[PDB]
């Protein structure tokens, strides 16, 4: 589907912003204590890629809402001084601009 | 000395408020990622005991400032919903009331 090519391109330009892959995979409680008690709706780019390939998103709107979820999760759990918080903030705003 | 008697009692009373010994020993960056860069003046009950034994406090004001420093540092480093933050803020205010 044409929406799938569009979203794959956007997903690719977004992931390039995350060269360490902090957003690549699900966060586990093992590597972020209490993370699942605090974030009740997890998201990551690998799940968004599975979502595009499953034709789960019917619009850029729905895809942007998962990207937002993912950055809002990292800004909620991580302290502001961290690499994770600062990346999430940065990419939230830059990626919304890039998708418009 | 007699100040030592006084401070040893206040210490044992404060330390009973911490049955898991969250504050018994210095925090290390391995149990608390990023701790030594954020907290510039670490404190814990063990360090406070040794300062009593070593006669470093000259007044109860100086002891209460290291107690507050220990609770301040926990408030700062730990997210507010954490057992660590909770117990630091709770014991800071109760220990100051107890020792006045």
């Amino acid at each position: 589907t044409p929406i799938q090519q569009l979203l794959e391109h956007f997903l690719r330009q977004l992931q390039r912003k995350d060269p360490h892959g902090f957003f690549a995979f699900p966060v586990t409680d093992a590597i972020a204590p209490g993370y699942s008690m605090i974030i009740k709706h997890p998201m990551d780019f690998g799940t968004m890629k599975d979502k595009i390939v499953a034709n789960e998103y019917k619009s850029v709107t729905e895809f942007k809402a998962d990207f937002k979820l993912m950055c809002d999760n990292a800004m909620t759990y991580n302290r502001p001084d961290t690499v994770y918080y600062k990346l999430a903030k940065k990419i939230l705003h830059a990626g919304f601009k890039m998708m418009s | 000395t007699p100040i030592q008697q006084l401070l040893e009692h206040f210490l044992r009373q404060l330390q009973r408020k911490d049955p898991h010994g969250f504050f018994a020993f210095p925090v290390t960056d391995a149990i608390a990622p990023g701790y030594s860069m954020i907290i510039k003046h670490p404190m814990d009950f063990g360090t406070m005991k040794d300062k009593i034994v070593a006669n470093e406090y000259k007044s109860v004001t100086e002891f209460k400032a290291d107690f507050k420093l220990m609770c301040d540092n926990a408030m700062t480093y730990n997210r507010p919903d954490t057992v660590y933050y909770k117990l630091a803020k709770k014991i800071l205010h109760a220990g100051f009331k107890m020792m006045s």
């Binding site: 966060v27 | 925090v27 608390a32």
Partner: peptide, 6 residues
């Protein structure tokens, strides 16, 4: 690298 204590 990630989180606080726990």
């Amino acid at each position: 690298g990630k989180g606080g204590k726990g």
